[PDB]
Amino acid sequence: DNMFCNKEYCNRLKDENNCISNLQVEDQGNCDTSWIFASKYHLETIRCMKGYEPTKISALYVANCYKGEHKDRCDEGSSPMEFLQIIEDYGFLPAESNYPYNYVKVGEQCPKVEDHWMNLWDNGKILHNKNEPNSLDGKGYTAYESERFHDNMDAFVKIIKTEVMNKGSVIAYIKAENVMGYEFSGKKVKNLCGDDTADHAVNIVGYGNYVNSEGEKKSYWIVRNSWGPYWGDEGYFKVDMYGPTHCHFNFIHSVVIFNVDLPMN
């Protein structure tokens, strides 16, 4: 447990006999549904931390089941907030095994929940507690932006490490173009700048220290993507936390955490 994930080093993929290592990488195909994959994986690791099985949430159900006017669910993404909204509106969260994802089905009619389907949100509550002395908490999610921590990156890193330890992951936003380089197919720690904006949700799932090719002591995030297990390094990659000095923007644009109440299993 602690030997695989502590303040200095965290890689739960190395503990083959634990829940999070059994959440296999998924392939979103050719729709812009990373918001669903990253959000549901964050809930999957939270469920692992609470003693539940590594049961995959149905990304397709979340894509296809929404209230109100028709949305463009393949060509355009959404946000983690909308993932939460779908959970609260429908109250039921089916398993991938019951309604399996194929990108060509993204946008089809929301399916009837069958009698034998598993609810992976049973006994689950999104928290909207008003605890702080201001009116801004209680959204069900909390977001932090690297640009707002420009002069306090140590705090940004600490917040993320704490959540990865406690919840098993955070949701992170990046610009997809930034991981498109030929070089992202290696096992090297990538080192690059982010952009002013982001458009693709991934998960930070771990971290560690390393020495870069210039002989400098540095640290990296371990990042999970949803482009299948043959992308990057078995579906994941490593990226320098602080990145190059000259960067206006960090590679990690922002992170999102879900605030939920879930009974231990």
How near is the Cβ of 145 to Ca ion at its closest, in Å?
8
Q: How far is the CB of 201 from Ca ion (least distance, A)?
A: 16
Interactions with Ca ion, residue window 119-178 (CB under 5 A) = 178
Pick from Cl ion, Ca ion, none: which does 195 bind, CB < 5 to 8 A by kind? Ca ion
Helix and strand totals (H; E) in the chain: 4, 9
Q: What is the DSSP string of 9-43?
A: -B-GGG-TTSTGGGS---B-TTSS-HHHHHHHHHH
Asked whether position 174 contacts Cl ion by CB under 5 A, the answer is no
Minimum distance between the CB of residue 5 and Ca ion, rounded to whole angstroms?
30
Quote the DSSP letter at residue 128: -
114 binds Ca ion (CB under 5 A): no
Regarding 246 and contact with Ca ion (CB under 5 A), the answer is no
Q: By CB under 5 A, is residue 127 in contact with Cl ion?
A: no
Q: Is 195 in the site for Ca ion (CB under 5 A)?
A: yes
Q: How far apart are CA 224 and CA 60, in angstroms?
A: 19
User: What's the closest the beta carbon of residue 238 comes to Cl ion, in angstroms?
Assistant: 20
Residue nearest Cl ion, CB atom distance: 77
Picking from 69, 70, 119, the residue whose alpha carbon sits closest to that of residue 90 is 119
Tokens of 142: 């909390």
Of 200, 203, 250, 253, the active-site residue reads 200
- Residue 263 C-beta-side C-alpha neighbours within 13 Å: 6
The whole-angstrom separation of Cα 234 and Cα 205 is 14
Q: Tell me which of Cl ion, Ca ion, none is bound by residue 48, counting a contact when its beta carbon lies within the kind-specific cut-off of 5 to 8 angstroms.
A: Cl ion
| Active centre residues (catalytic) | 200, 225
In the complex, the residues that contact Ca ion under the rule CB under 5 A are: 178, 195-196
